[PDB]
Amino acid sequence: ECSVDIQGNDQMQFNTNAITVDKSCKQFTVNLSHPGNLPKNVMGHNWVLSTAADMQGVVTCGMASGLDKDYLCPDDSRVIAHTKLIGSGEKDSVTFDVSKLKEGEQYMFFCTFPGHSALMKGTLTLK
Ligand SMILES: [Zn+2]
16 A cells, blocks of 8 residues: 565565555555564665665765664765664564655665665655
């Protein structure tokens, strides 16, 4: 409806590649969980949303910020929404206002844990 449940596993994979946000939604929520066995310092996953153009810079800034900031730069204006960084058996939800999205743009979601973004990314589109 106006939410999606996403799992990030021990093989650096999200279980979706593409999220659609319905125009009727005023908020949208992502419920993130982490099946598998590995703790967050070795296989952490977050779900972070930006424009496609901003993805790399978000990722690089996160790398500079490190594990103790959950691999995101504090106050990064390019981050539309984000969960916290989670490890196995943990969960986190993020809810954001759909007014923050422009219609028909293919934003990207991804994990900013070192090395996860090229495998752990997808599109989000407001339709
Ligand atoms: Zn990850």
